Each structure stands twice: as structure tokens, then as C-alpha cells.
Amino acid sequence: SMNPPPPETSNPNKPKRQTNQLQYLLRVVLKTLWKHQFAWPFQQPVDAVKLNLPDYYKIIKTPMDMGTIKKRLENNYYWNAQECIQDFNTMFTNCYIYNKPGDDIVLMAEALEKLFLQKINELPTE
Numbered sequence: 001s002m003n004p005p006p007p008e009t010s011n012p013n014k015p016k017r018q019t020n021q022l023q024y025l026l027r028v029v030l031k032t033l034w035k036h037q038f039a040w041p042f043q044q045p046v047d048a049v050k051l052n053l054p055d056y057y058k059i060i061k062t063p064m065d066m067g068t069i070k071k072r073l074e075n076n077y078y079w080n081a082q083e084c085i086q087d088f089n090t091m092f093t094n095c096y097i098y099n100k101p102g103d104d105i106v107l108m109a110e111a112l113e114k115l116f117l118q119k120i121n122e123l124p125t126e
């Protein structure tokens with residue numbers, strides 16, 4: 001019906017940090033995840049108005065998308081890698097929660113999540 005405001009990507013009161021693990025996650029996003037053929041539905045907040053999904057934000061109370069994550073990394077919004085990993089997990093589980101097994105969008109999220117999990121298993125030490 002109306003879209004909510006998107007998740008913040010900067011906040012003057014939230015401590016900001018650059019770490020080698022967060023740099024690695026930014027590289028994973030820019031070099032791999034953002035360019036993936038299934039990235040497009042996840043590159044920006046779900047536009048429930050344009051997609052005619054009036055129930056989306058009744059069901060999804062913690063929205064997250066890869067455009068927000070990318071901007072958070074680019075703005076040094078995160079303090080640690082775990083915060084970014086959590087945002088990815090929120091993004092994928094939101095897709096599974098709103099949709100139904102076998103939906104095309106769920107298959108896309110599953111492939112992106114599997115690739116992301118591969119990259120997380122190669123996360124460097126701090």
C-alpha cells in the first residue's frame with residue numbers, strides 16, 4: 001500500500017569501522033554477488049507499491065536487501081562482519097518467509113545464499 005522507509009545506510013550515532021573482514025565482504029558483494037544473474041530482485045528494497053504486494057510489509061517486519069547491505073559496507077556502517085552476515089541472513093530468510101517453497105524467487109535466493117555461504121567459509125581472520 002505504502003512502502004516503509006528503507007533501512008538506514010548511515011547513522012551519525014552508530015560507531016563506524018573498517019576491518020579486513022568487512023573489506024572482504026565488500027569485495028564479495030562487488031566482485032561476485034552484485035553481478036550474479038539472480039541478484040536483481042535483491043538489489044533494492046522490495047517496492048510493495050510497484051509490485052502490488054500489499055501484504056509484504058505486513059509479513060516482513062525486518063526488511064533487508066543487498067542494495068542496503070552494499071551501501072552500508074560502502075559507508076562503513078557496520079562495526080563487524082557479523083552485523084553484515086546477519087543482514088544477509090535476514091534478506092534470505094525474509095524471502096523464504098514471504099514466499100512459498102518452489103517459487104522462482106525462492107530458488108534464486110537459495111542459489112545466492114549457497115554462494116554467499118561458500119564465501120563466508122573463506123572469511124579471513126581479523
Ligand SMILES: Cc1noc(C)c1-c1ccc2c(c1)nc(CCc1ccc(OCCCN(C)C)cc1)n2CCN1CCN(CC(=O)NCCOc2cccc3c2C(=O)N([C@@H]2CCC(=O)NC2=O)C3=O)CC1
Nearest residue numbers: 037040041042044045046047051053094095096098099105
Ligand atoms: C526479493 C523478493 N522477495 O519476495 C519477492 C516477491 C521479491 C521480489 C523483489 C523484486 C522483484 C520481484 C520479486 N519480481 C520482480 C519483477 C518480476 C517481473 C515482473 C514482470 C515482468 O515482465 C512483465 C512482462 C509483460 N507481461 C504482459 C508478461 C518481468 C519480471 N521484482 C522487481 C525487480 N525490479 C527490476 C527493475 N529494478 C530497477 C532497474 O532498473 N533495475 C535494473 C536491472 O533490471 C533487471 C535486471 C535483471 C533482470 C530484470 C531486470 C528488470 O527490470 N526486469 C523486468 C523487466 C520487465 C518488467 O516489467 N519488470 C522487470 O523487473 C528483469 O527481468 C527494480 C527491481
